[PDB]
Amino acid sequence: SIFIAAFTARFLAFLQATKAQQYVDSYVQESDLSEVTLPPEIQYFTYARDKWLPSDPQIISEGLYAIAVVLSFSRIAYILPANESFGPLQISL
């Protein structure tokens, strides 16, 4: 479920990003985006890592993804009891 949550948050961030990209490509015409001044709700998606809103969906995605990776490494418990030397150690643990 935490993997699902991380990927859902990443997908929401991607949807917002591609909506901003669609707005930029649709309404404004120029050579480089940097010279242009954009509406702020759309311009926010041009900001770097530091500016990013604390509750950005991609921050949630990164955090949940790290937790999910740490937990996914725990699945070795389904595999260890088959071994002759690591089984009893897992039982005692």
Ligand X SMILES: CC(C)CCC[C@@H](C)[C@H]1CC[C@H]2[C@@H]3CC=C4C[C@@H](OC(=O)CCC(=O)O)CC[C@]4(C)[C@H]3CC[C@]12C
Ligand Y SMILES: CCCCCCCC/C=C\CCCCCCCC(=O)O[C@@H](COC(=O)CCCCCCCCCCCCCCC)COP(=O)([O-])OCC[N+](C)(C)C
The one among 21, 22, 72, 83 contacting ligand X by CB under 6 A: 83
Distance CA 44, CA 83 (A): 54
Q: Is 40 in the site for ligand Y (CB under 6 A)?
A: no
The one among 9, 20, 58, 65 contacting ligand X by CB under 6 A: 9
Which of 23, 50, 56 lies closest to 38, judged by CA?
23
43-82 binders of ligand X (CB under 6 A): 55, 57, 60, 76, 79-80, 82
Which of 77, 72, 73, 82 lies closest to 93, judged by CA?
77
Residues of the shown chain interacting with ligand Y in the complex, contacts defined by CB under 6 A: 1-2, 5, 54-55, 60, 67
